[PDB]
């Protein structure tokens, strides 16, 4: 995306154009969250 701040993407782009950048950020951050949760589950099994 053009910027890592959702406010900066929304303040400078119309809705239809901002959808793409907001979606790039959504996909990236969802991937990072999923990676975090999977690693946490594996570590939780080890600690258990």
């Amino acid at each position: 995306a053009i910027s890592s701040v959702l406010n900066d993407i929304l303040s400078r782009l119309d809705p239809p154009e901002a959808e793409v950048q907001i979606d790039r950020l959504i996909t990236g951050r969802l991937q990072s969250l999923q990676t975090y949760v999977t690693q946490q589950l594996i570590r939780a099994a080890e600690i258990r």
Binding site: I2, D8, S11, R12, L13, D14, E17, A18
Partner: protein
Amino acid sequence: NATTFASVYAWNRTRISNCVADYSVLYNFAPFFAFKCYGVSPTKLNDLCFTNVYADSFVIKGNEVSQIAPGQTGNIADYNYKLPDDFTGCVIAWNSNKLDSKHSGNYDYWYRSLRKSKLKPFERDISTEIYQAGNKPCKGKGPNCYFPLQSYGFRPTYGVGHQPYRVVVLSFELLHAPATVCGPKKSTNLVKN
């Protein structure tokens, strides 16, 4: 508006700073053959603040408007005026037949066609040195030697697809601390806690 803008190989450049920009005035112009803003919505242009704006004016061909875009191909795009791949700004193109066309032929506008290598983005080449083809040295007009600058030869009798097009690129750097050009939005009082 002005009266005359330089050729593409020597595109006119000016800086806008330390002022409030009211982009609504742009709507005053009627034709607007092309109005394409990359990296910013035009309607939002009045709400942001830009560090320093750069206005580049020149006259492009009828069908060469599409070459004014990042990563474009063609002689004009990578020989006379190259836009960066990460360009963030607006491009305006409108017809100029009634002002930039001569019945006998308007040869005052020139574009470069021969050069050793493509230009870097936002690079201007004003030299008129002859071009050498191969390894034979060139000392004037003749074989393997040609003048890089070619006249447009604008004529009002030409079709719309070949008419001259006044093209201006407004390139601005986004918020990187020292913002000077700001929109017409009025400020308010400050409240803490």
